[PDB]
Design a binder for these strands. Sequence first.
RNA 1: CCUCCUAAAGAGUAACGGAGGAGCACGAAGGUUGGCUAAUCCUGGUCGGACAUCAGGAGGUUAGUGCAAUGGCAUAAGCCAGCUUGACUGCGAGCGUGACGGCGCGAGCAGGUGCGAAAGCAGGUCAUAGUGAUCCGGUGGUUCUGAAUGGAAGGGCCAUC
RNA 2: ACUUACCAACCCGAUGCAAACUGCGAAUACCGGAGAAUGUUAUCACGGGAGACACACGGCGGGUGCUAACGUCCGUC
RNA 3: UGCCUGGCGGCCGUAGCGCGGUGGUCCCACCUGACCCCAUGCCGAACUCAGAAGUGAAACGCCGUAGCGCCGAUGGUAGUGUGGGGUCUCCCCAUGCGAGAGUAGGGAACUGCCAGGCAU
Lengths: 51, 117, 76, 136, 177
Amino acid sequence: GIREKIKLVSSAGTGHFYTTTKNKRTKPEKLELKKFDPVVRQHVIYKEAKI
Amino acid sequence: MDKKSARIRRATRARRKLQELGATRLVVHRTPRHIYAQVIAPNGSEVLVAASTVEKAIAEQLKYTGNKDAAAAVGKAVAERALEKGIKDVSFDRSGFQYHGRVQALADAAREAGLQF
Amino acid sequence: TRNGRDSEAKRLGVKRFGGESVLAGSIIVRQRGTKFHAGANVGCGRDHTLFAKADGKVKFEVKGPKNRKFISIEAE
Amino acid sequence: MLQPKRTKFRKMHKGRNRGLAQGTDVSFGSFGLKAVGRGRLTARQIEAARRAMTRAVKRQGKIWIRVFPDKPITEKPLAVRMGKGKGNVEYWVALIQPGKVLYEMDGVPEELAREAFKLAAAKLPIKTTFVTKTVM
Amino acid sequence: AKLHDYYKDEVVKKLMTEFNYNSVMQVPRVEKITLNMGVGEAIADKKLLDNAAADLAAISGQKPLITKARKSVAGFKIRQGYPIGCKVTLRGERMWEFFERLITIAVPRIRDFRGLSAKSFDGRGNYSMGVREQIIFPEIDYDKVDRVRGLDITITTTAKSDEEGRALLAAFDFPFR
RNA sequence: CCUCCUAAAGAGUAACGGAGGAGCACGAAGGUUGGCUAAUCCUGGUCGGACAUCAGGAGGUUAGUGCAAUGGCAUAAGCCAGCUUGACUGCGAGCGUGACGGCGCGAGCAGGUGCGAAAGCAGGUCAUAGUGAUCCGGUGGUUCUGAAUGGAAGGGCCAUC
RNA sequence: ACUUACCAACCCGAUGCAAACUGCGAAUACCGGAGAAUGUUAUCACGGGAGACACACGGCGGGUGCUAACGUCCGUC
RNA sequence: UGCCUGGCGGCCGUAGCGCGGUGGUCCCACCUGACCCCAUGCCGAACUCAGAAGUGAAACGCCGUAGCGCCGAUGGUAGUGUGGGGUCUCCCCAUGCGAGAGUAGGGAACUGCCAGGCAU
Ligand SMILES: [Mg+2]
Ligand SMILES: [Mg+2]
Ligand SMILES: [Mg+2]
Ligand SMILES: [Mg+2]
Ligand SMILES: [Mg+2]
Ligand SMILES: [Mg+2]
Ligand SMILES: [Mg+2]
Ligand SMILES: [Mg+2]
Ligand SMILES: [Mg+2]
Ligand SMILES: [Mg+2]
Ligand SMILES: [Mg+2]
Ligand SMILES: [Mg+2]
Ligand SMILES: [Mg+2]
Ligand SMILES: [Mg+2]
Ligand SMILES: [Mg+2]
Ligand SMILES: [Mg+2]
Ligand SMILES: [Mg+2]
Ligand SMILES: [Mg+2]
Ligand SMILES: [Mg+2]
Ligand SMILES: [Mg+2]
């Protein structure tokens, strides 16, 4: 509704991405989370991008 | 809640989980003056092994029965008595007390003596 | 204001009754809360569904100080 | 005129009116007017009967009404077809089973209570009987 | 420390002969001293609560706990979790050091002081009093204080009755009427 | 689409029957470890009142649960803090519920991860609403395909709009 | 602050009422196990061919309507 | 073997609450001290550590006690499956099942493993 779809991209260089939502007004900073990359088969850092 | 009933409430979740897993537990009881340890069968109604500071053989070699050194002695004692009966693998039941000081001194000494938890 | 609405029936209730021989994984009861609690060899799912954790017979019992309903699985 | 001051719900299923009454003894007064029949007492019927017995005793003694019209009755007006919602609440009834003590009285002689209850009974849609308080 | 020694050496003895207790553990003890500042007006000016907390911190040598609204009430126009006051629970050495400072220098500095009430007991031995001006406490500087504020003082005891609680405080020569 | 009643003590069950609610929220309001426990009333207490914050007693979950209702909830599922990303990827014995398309619950297995001393717990949130098939098209990835052949376009597959 | 032929929640004793109340609670009905007799397999699976998806009244239990209707809507025979 | 106490269970109110009495050698509790381990959205209250001067006051355990909770017949009543029937909104009869409430009454738990103190 007032919540937008965002993609979290892998820092490992693989084109792998997770997909989620964000309240862009209340939380304007880019979301960063450590997530499992199935291409490198390791937990690497994931950084927000536009969907 | 009064001290005892607050501690029994703090103990209930871990005890139900150990009952569910069918684990043989090393149950610890602490008092300002004494420390106690019981190895209880998964049924919860029979004590396989025990050691405490109320026992003359253990207390005689201790300065004060309610301190960390006395706790380490009780821990070493239960684990030795348990290994003599073939009991190796257990699960620690802190019985609502913090895993700290005297309780942790008993646990650390039991693990050192050979008890697996 | 106006009525006229209802939702789809969720088909909850007991799936396997006392004494029934089940294979591990079999749903025993679909409930909204824990009307029945998981006893020995019975698990509780995210929607409070009770299921068999082992092959055996469904056993219903009343246990504890609160006289709670528990479903367990007895080996056959 | 008796009526619940507030209710959880406005309307009620028709239901049925099987069984025998609960509250069959003279519990507060010396005499009572008991239902022998089955039926519905409206708030207006209960008020008409209360007035008749009260005038009769020249507002002396004490009167208890053991019944309460807590059941809402709906009705569809003229030139209205079937359906299009449950009708509107028009009046309130008490469900009556054989044996209910409807009214009680004391502080008056038996002959006056019998006459006051005779006058009140003539306002009611169900057959009644005169009852007296008992030892157990 | 001084008034706790006075309790042990002289108060215990006085109460034992007054009520003829079989055990010394029946003798009422001063359990805790609770200080409270109901700010209330902190909702309009947030800075007023900070100054009240700094006042309480000077009066009693410990960090005050800012108390929030337990439930919302339309009457005072407050929503749940709004900082609407501050409290300090005094026990042991700090409680005794405060108790002496209260009887010896703070309470005698009350404007036209003739004696505190002896009837303001909760019915179970605990004593409750209020101060109108916080400047009675020498720990507060008259030149630096932004506003004149008051506070609640509750002395929680182990006395079962008001008569017992009264005798406990009177034994410390607590300035009563 | 969700909750309750009608619904006749398994499931299901109709009407322009009786009552309400959803078309979202949340990077914590998720995970874990450790801790904690309401409502309401009586008595006392600066400003302070019927009701603010403080103390004691009664009470005992009537409170609380992001939101309707119902079932749950103290071992809390309610409230707080520390550390955190399991709101993991591949699968899945066995079940539930559907005419079907589907939808749901699931222990366990492999890889990798968080929390805990450990037993352990975690594949989002107390649960049940919060939704849109297919076609066509867009973006990224790709041991697939590539109309003579090498490429490319376009197509497939995987992720997503 | 004092007081009143008024009204008065909670609490205690007594008395009822509830589809959307429950500190109780049947009969039946339904799920499962075992066993006989009986029943032209009555059962399940797959495959060929359908028809049917306007129902009616009566009994019982209900919603709606007025416990009106040869009324209307479910359940079950 | 008996009495007492601690721990862990079974059982889940005939087991709980209240009222009265009672216990400290031991155990338990409160208690003493706190710089420190560790802790308080403040507080050594709690959590925690080092202890033993005091007291069983509170708590806790035990013994007693039917004010309450709780358990609870028999008999009757209500309902109801099947078959029959009436004056069919509701009932009755045969048969089977048979409450809830209330009444008499019961009731101040029972029990296992291990450890400690005391006594014979
Ligand atoms: Mg049903
Ligand atoms: Mg049914
Ligand atoms: Mg939550
Ligand atoms: Mg926890
Ligand atoms: Mg007040
Ligand atoms: Mg680790
Ligand atoms: Mg080519
Ligand atoms: Mg076929
Ligand atoms: Mg058709
Ligand atoms: Mg049709
Ligand atoms: Mg039909
Ligand atoms: Mg017809
Ligand atoms: Mg202490
Ligand atoms: Mg005592
Ligand atoms: Mg019988
Ligand atoms: Mg019975
Ligand atoms: Mg009975
Ligand atoms: Mg009873
Ligand atoms: Mg008796
Ligand atoms: Mg012994």
